[model samples]
Target chain A: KSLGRHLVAEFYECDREVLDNVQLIEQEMKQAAYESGATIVTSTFHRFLPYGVSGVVVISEAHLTIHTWPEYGYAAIDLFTCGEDVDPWKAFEHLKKALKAKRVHVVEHERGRYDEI
Target chain B: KSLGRHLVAEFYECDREVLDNVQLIEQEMKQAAYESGATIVTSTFHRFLPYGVSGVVVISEAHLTIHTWPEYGYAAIDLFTCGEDVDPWKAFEHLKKALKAKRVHVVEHERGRYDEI
Candidate 1:
């Protein structure tokens, strides 16, 4: 098994319009996945009852997910990918641009330490 | 917006049969969500072509997701919750037992730090 990278990002002051648009969010996530060197498997996105959106993009490397609050101008994202070929930071940067986030807080964790386990 | 907790867990030597069952995974996830003090919104799970499964549970606090690889006896999980009432670790521990994993590695992250941004 390969090492996985888990990226937890908090996007602040994001464009409310972009976060609320399900189609745009899904397209950008797919684009970000490929740009980060991960092959696509499939994806699912759901628009909440009256507002907000929750989505996940499963890739050959691993997965990426996002939950947004348009009213708060905030979004929570997790981009987890395994193996040496994928660069999750590229996907991070792509989302920073796509969502028009004014400020971002991101932390990376190394997951799936099989040897240590 | 409330503070969010992100739990990334790596399950090793998991019961392959349990991982492949979509209904079981979904039920356990929902049970975990409620046990963690999260209010459920909705959920989705997809069984892959030949094998494997990808699923997500959206909660009032945030979201929980799982990606399984039965062939490798591995499963990757993310349990993210926002708010003081939600304890992501509860959900984490529940999944460990439900999946019948021999070994587990878990990490917790504090997300949506609005003050820091």
Candidate 2:
């Protein structure tokens, strides 16, 4: 159940208008998922600030999470899910293309699932 | 030695001027650590957008981290340390006071550590 991958992204120079619209933002996220070819079972969104970023965590057969930062025209996005069948990068590219991000930094962390016994 | 604490903070309505001052912000973080009574061994900073937030992760005996978000007057600060000697709340309060944040939300999570059999 613990086999999965986590993708962390640090983006800069995103458009402010796109970041402020929650509906459009989430829509893009959904589209990103579909384009990624990953099966998302359930999704959740948490609102923090009015013009700030929102968290869209989608729990899938793999694992869960998609956190966003919109205010600085930036987002510290996370894609954590478990499954050998899902590829998180495809979804990330969708987000990048939609946001028109010119400069972005990415860190790919492998979360090893090991038995304690 | 995984025996410390983690403090995560969500702040709003902070003055944007303070957020833009990267030098001042980093100084304040150093102060927060001092007040928290934790020993910081190493610290690294990652700057995203010009007026965006910064992430400072400190590696110490407590196993550290301190992430900051200045764009929306918000910060998703995380302090993950190991040891009964440190208190995450004190550090949280320090950040709160430094930023003069009126609305702050916090989530406390207990990460259990166990020896492999």
Candidate 3:
């Protein structure tokens, strides 16, 4: 049995404007989390020098985080969820669409696995 | 060249006690980040029901996060750092040692990558 799922997702050729807009990105991502069945919790986002944004959406199932490089039109997001209640892919799909990414890729991992637990 | 590195690390057969200790884990992880050349930033963690902990350490270069399942003696930690100033593995080594893990594995990804950007 496994305890959780983690998605290491990459969005390439994303909308540079959206990536750099901290408020917009936060709004879209938080909504994405909610659409993914994530039980709402507090979250934070910050814009640093030249870099787009770095943030985390803390959730009951887990967290959804994003770090963007608007210069490269890229964003790296992780949808880490524990238990069977949340669908990480829903968030994944929502973000890529929200960011208007031209190309996107994701790797799914089964975390906390055991022989019979 | 890549904008940053992300490590999806898994620790198996970890010290259950250490995995369940939120404060101790946080302290060790912060030191680990600093040891890896990450400038200190604000961090937060929360313990969930039946789970060990969920936390994120925000760093100047990027962020480091962890989620634990003490019942399975497992922990999934991410050393997601940007720029050349930090080495994620240093934090990896620190956490494994801190948790007294018996087995560990990791996968590294080059994020924000582009052909010539």
| Per-residue lDDT value at B53 in model 2 | 39
Which of candidates 1 and 3 reaches a greater lDDT? Answer: 1
lDDT of 2 by residue, B23-47 (tens): 7667777777777777664443444
lDDT for B68 in candidate 2 is 37
The DockQ assigned to candidate 1 is 0.43
- C-alpha positional error of residue B64 in candidate 3 after TM-score superposition, expressed in Å: 0.6
Ranking by TM-score: 3, 1, 2
* Candidate 1 ranges beyond 4 A from true positions: A48-51, B47-51
Q: Between candidates 1 and 3, which one is better according to DockQ?
A: 3
* lDDT string, candidate 1, B15-102, tens digits: 9999889899999999999889998877878786665877888787478888788877788888898788899989988998999999
Q: Residue B68, candidate 3: how far off, in angstroms?
A: 1.0
DockQ, each predicted model:
0.43, 0.03, 0.57
Compare the candidates by DockQ and give the number of the best one. 3
Error of 1 at B46 (Å): 3.5
Candidate 3 deviant stretches above 4 angstroms: none
Error of 3 at B102 (Å): 0.6
Distance (Å) between predicted and true CA of B101, model 3? 0.4
